Amino acid sequence: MKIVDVLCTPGLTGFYFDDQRAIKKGAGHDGFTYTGSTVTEGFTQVRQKGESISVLLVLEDGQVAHGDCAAVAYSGAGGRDPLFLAKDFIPVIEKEIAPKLIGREITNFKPMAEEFDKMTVNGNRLHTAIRYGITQAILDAVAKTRKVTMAEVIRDEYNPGAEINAVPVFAQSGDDRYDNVDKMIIKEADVLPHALINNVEEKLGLKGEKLLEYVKWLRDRIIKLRVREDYAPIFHIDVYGTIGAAFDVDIKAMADYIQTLAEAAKPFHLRIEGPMDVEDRQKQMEAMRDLRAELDGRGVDAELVADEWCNTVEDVKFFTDNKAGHMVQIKTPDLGGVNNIADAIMYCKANGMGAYCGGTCNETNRSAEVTTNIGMACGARQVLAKPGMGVDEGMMIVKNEMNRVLALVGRRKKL
Amino acid sequence: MKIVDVLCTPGLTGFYFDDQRAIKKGAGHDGFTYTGSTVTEGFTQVRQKGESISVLLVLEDGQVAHGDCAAVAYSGAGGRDPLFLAKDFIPVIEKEIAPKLIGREITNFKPMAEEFDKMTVNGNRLHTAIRYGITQAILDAVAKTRKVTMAEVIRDEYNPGAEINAVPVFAQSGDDRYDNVDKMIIKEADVLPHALINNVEEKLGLKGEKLLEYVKWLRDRIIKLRVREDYAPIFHIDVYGTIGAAFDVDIKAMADYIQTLAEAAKPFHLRIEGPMDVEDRQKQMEAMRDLRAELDGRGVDAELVADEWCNTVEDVKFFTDNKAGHMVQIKTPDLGGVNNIADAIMYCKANGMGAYCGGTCNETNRSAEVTTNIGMACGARQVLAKPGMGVDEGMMIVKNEMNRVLALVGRRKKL
Ligand SMILES: [Cl-]
Ligand SMILES: [Mg+2]
Ligand SMILES: [Mg+2]
């Protein structure tokens, strides 16, 4: 099957481009908007519409493969590629990438994805978001050519022989950590709520006392609201390094604190994302490794999820190798070509590291469908319900795709 | 080409099933839930998860057509089919419709959709949600057989010789009529905000003063936040009959009051949905017609959008024939077969009535893509951004689908 055409359309995402540098300097509030001057190049406002590029591969048989280019909300922030304005990046795809695809015979997903993930123009690598879209399109093209699900393609090429099963769906609440919890309970998230505990005083408490009461509220809320008695989701709470800050990164003091969180969470199981956030990757690994080893040596039944300083596939291998937490976050848009997600997940598996197949609230419905398929195929420990902060939509996009994929795969076994 | 297999999966939606009867009975808000006894049959809490049924037709070439069965959030309410629980209706599909689809030749969309729309079981019509889902799936099957967009199939069969263009996108705010407005301005909604003015004293104001003030605020908000000065969206406010109630359905008084909103909305054009809500369909048509008469005769360029008592295709024909409003809401989930959306729009356009291609917050990402296609094909006046109350997600689904479909058609025009 040849590719005969390549179309690009600009688009929306499930959220916003936020000027992080402006927000961290003290950008004020006004309704759903931020105020004051923009700090980051390219921004016209501190908050503006998040953008995507839909990449369409017209196939020889007339089918159309579809992937979406997207970046995180903090597009163009520290250590990221420039603000992903479709206007700036459609011309690159149309003049540098499309001619490399038109007339190409569709081969396996792995080699083609890798070619396009590493490709250079003027000796310079492609914007992560473009690699993200183009490889999603390529995966969808392989799947359509072979008449199977994207999951199945990824399984064949990255996880030979394995079963494809449902993956636990993790929902994120943002600051509305009470109302969106209700949403998640009612939509039966397998993992919840993130809770956006990004403030020591306001959100954690100076002694961690606020999060402690939140965990108790959360446990009770589930017991009260759940339709089915046997619905028992896993707690996943992101403390943006505030446990570290509130306890001066004292390994033992953090673990003692975390133990009381666990006591408060029971009967439910507790995952804490980003306990600490220290000053370099080496020392983040060490602090995660040792806090895990502390928790583990004492038999405190809480898991740590890596985030801060764990970005690249190389990072994923580094945190994995060194058991720097119990779960490593695989950051789908940041990794560029979606083949890297599968590589990263499969490394985690091979080394017994829990794999959180993540994403951004600022990507699309399509990009979410694709990476869900990857998550399923590689047996990730959980996948993010995404995009958007509405919760319902993100859960629907991700779980419905999961459900249909399992239906189709199961049909194929009995043929 | 035939359909070779049918798969049904249970799914989520962008929203919830709410027991409307209980909500009117006085169910108290608690977080994102409602307290107390359910009043409607089949409900187990006053708010429960929205449910969908993804319908997949496997065709003999190995492509998979996908349609989503979905109902309104007030599933099971007055004049409605029973609460659309997946577990209740999947077996109906599997037993009664799958055998009729497996082995069926793909001919044209129109006769296939009509057969399945009007299909009976033990003498009784099928649930509107099943008809909704099945016909979507059929439409997609037809498109995939012909290797064209869903829009092009509908254009070919209902709107011959027409171009397919972008359609104004309308966003709903729900009660958060302030912050969600900000969203819509940042995402550049063509029509906004709905505003859920569903209460006389709290929302409209007794003498209309609250809506008037909200209009003023809305106008300033757009001028305040718009990225580019020539963004001039259309105001569309739903008032749930309350202008009728506050002004004793007096035509002159209502005409006078909308004139003031119109004046307060300038430079922005205003549409008011459901100005009144009377005792029966006949008196509803008359009030709509006479109110439009007054405004038109007085040259107040503000429009009236029909809703209440305008439900089926005969109703849309009824409101069209008697110029009862300037626009009519085509209620996509409620109409069953999606072929009926095409018939209703095209009637409206043959007789110079605005066609509002609607939907629900409680349908799916897929149903929204499909009916968006129908809207474009028949050249609707506007389409609802949907599903979900998040706003961002429903705008992305609807508008990103819109842009891709136009890119594909434009390509086909140059082939
Ligand atoms: Cl909240
Ligand atoms: Mg984190
Ligand atoms: Mg209405």
Domains of chain B: 2-164 (3.30.390.10), 165-398 (3.20.20.120)
Cα-to-chain-centroid distance, residue A47: 21
3-state secondary structure of A227: coil
B239 C-alpha to ligand 3 centroid (Å): 7
DSSP state of B90: H
CA pair distance A109, A143, nearest whole angstrom: 9
Q: Under an 8 A CB cutoff, do B400 and A227 touch? A: no
CA pair distance A205, B52, nearest whole angstrom: 41
Number of alpha carbons in the 13 Å side-chain half-sphere of residue B235: 31
In this structure, what token pair is assigned to residue A60?
């020889």
Q: Is A329 annotated as a binding residue?
A: yes
List helix spans (H) across A119-149.
128-146
Among B49, B178, B403, beta carbon nearest to A31: B178
In this structure, what token pair is assigned to residue A36?
């004051």
Query: What is the DSSP track for A297-332?
Result: HHT--EEEEE-TT--SHHHHHHHHHTT-SSEEEE-T
Among B54, B400, B411, beta carbon nearest to A54: B400
Q: Under an 8 A CB cutoff, do B400 and A366 touch? A: yes
In this structure, what token pair is assigned to residue A316?
């994923």
CA pair distance B271, B265, nearest whole angstrom: 10
B193 touches chain A (CB under 8 A): no
Distance from CA of B204 to the nearest CA of A (A): 21
* CA distances (Å), origin A158, targets A133, A154, A255: 20, 6, 36
A173 C-alpha to ligand 1 centroid (Å): 8
In this structure, what token pair is assigned to residue A334?
């940041």
Resolution of the entry in angstroms = 2.0
Catalytic residue selected from A144, A331, A349, A399: A331
CA pair distance B293, B2, nearest whole angstrom: 52
Tally Cβ neighbours within 10 Å of residue B287: 24
* CA distances (Å), origin B349, targets A24, B41, B57, B163, B305: 52, 39, 32, 14, 15
Q: Under an 8 A CB cutoff, do B411 and A5 touch? A: yes
Q: Under an 8 A CB cutoff, do B14 and A49 touch? A: no
* CA distances (Å), origin B32, targets A176, A192, B252: 11, 16, 41
Residue indicated by tokens 């009975």:
B25
CA pair distance B154, B164, nearest whole angstrom: 10
B14 touches chain A (CB under 8 A): yes
Query: What is the DSSP track for B135-163?
Result: HHHHHHHHHHHTTS-HHHHHHHHHSTT--
Distance from CA of A88 to the nearest CA of B (A): 17
Q: Under an 8 A CB cutoff, do B407 and A56 touch? A: yes
Enumerate residues 6+ apart whose C-beta is below 8 A from B222.
Answer: B185, B231, B233, B268
Task: Report strand pairing: B382-384 vs B354-357.
Answer: parallel
Of B311, B310, B341, nearest to B136 (Cα)? B341
Mutate: best of B13, B32, B150, B366, partner A, most A CBs <10 A = B32
On whether the CB atoms of residues B22 and B47 are closer than 8 A, the answer is: no
Give the number of beta-carbon pairs within 8 Å between A and B: 187
* CA distances (Å), origin B295, targets A53, B241, B274: 44, 17, 15
CA pair distance A207, A209, nearest whole angstrom: 5
DSSP state of A81: P
* CA distances (Å), origin A253, targets A203, A212, A248, A287, A303: 19, 15, 9, 13, 16
Number of alpha carbons in the 13 Å side-chain half-sphere of residue B5: 14
Among B7, B50, B411, beta carbon nearest to A7: B411
Residue indicated by tokens 């109630």:
B245
Q: Under an 8 A CB cutoff, do A180 and B32 touch? A: yes
A14 touches chain B (CB under 8 A): yes
B52 touches chain A (CB under 8 A): yes
Cα-to-chain-centroid distance, residue A194: 12
3-state secondary structure of A292: helix
List helix spans (H) across B275-338.
281-297, 313-321
Q: Under an 8 A CB cutoff, do B365 and A33 touch? A: no
- The A residues from 130 to 169 touching B (CB cutoff 8 Å) are 144, 147
DSSP state of B81: P
Question: Residues of B marked as binding?
Answer: 172, 238, 273, 307, 329, 360-361
* A chain contacts of residue B225, beta-carbon cutoff 8 Å: 33
CA pair distance B46, B40, nearest whole angstrom: 8
Enumerate residues 6+ apart whose C-beta is below 8 A from B198.
Answer: B238, B239, B240, B242
Q: Nearest ligand to the C-alpha of residue B331?
A: 3
On whether the CB atoms of residues A169 and A385 are closer than 8 A, the answer is: yes
Tally Cβ neighbours within 10 Å of residue A101: 23
- The B residues from 241 to 300 touching A (CB cutoff 8 Å) are none
Distance from CA of A253 to the nearest CA of B (A): 34
Write down the experimental method used for this entry.
X-ray
CA pair distance B31, B147, nearest whole angstrom: 47
Q: Under an 8 A CB cutoff, do B11 and A396 touch? A: yes
Distance from CA of B115 to the nearest CA of A (A): 26
Q: Is A284 annotated as a binding residue?
A: no
CA pair distance A333, A337, nearest whole angstrom: 8
* B chain contacts of residue A400, beta-carbon cutoff 8 Å: 9, 11-12, 52, 54, 68, 364-366
B32 C-alpha to ligand 1 centroid (Å): 8
Taking a 5 Å cut-off on Cβ, the residues next to ion ligand 1 are A 176, 178-179
Give helix B150-158 / helix B392-414 axis angle, nearest 10°.
70
- The B residues from 53 to 92 touching A (CB cutoff 8 Å) are 54, 56, 58, 61-64, 66, 68
Task: Report strand pairing: B327-330 vs B169-170.
Answer: unpaired
On whether the CB atoms of residues B137 and B150 are closer than 8 A, the answer is: no
DSSP state of B380: -
Helix H or strand E segment including A49: strand A47-59
Among A62, A178, A399, beta carbon nearest to B31: A178
Q: Under an 8 A CB cutoff, do A389 and B389 touch? A: no
CA pair distance B343, B339, nearest whole angstrom: 7
Q: Under an 8 A CB cutoff, do A396 and B14 touch? A: yes
* A chain contacts of residue B5, beta-carbon cutoff 8 Å: 411
Q: Is B331 a catalytic residue?
A: yes
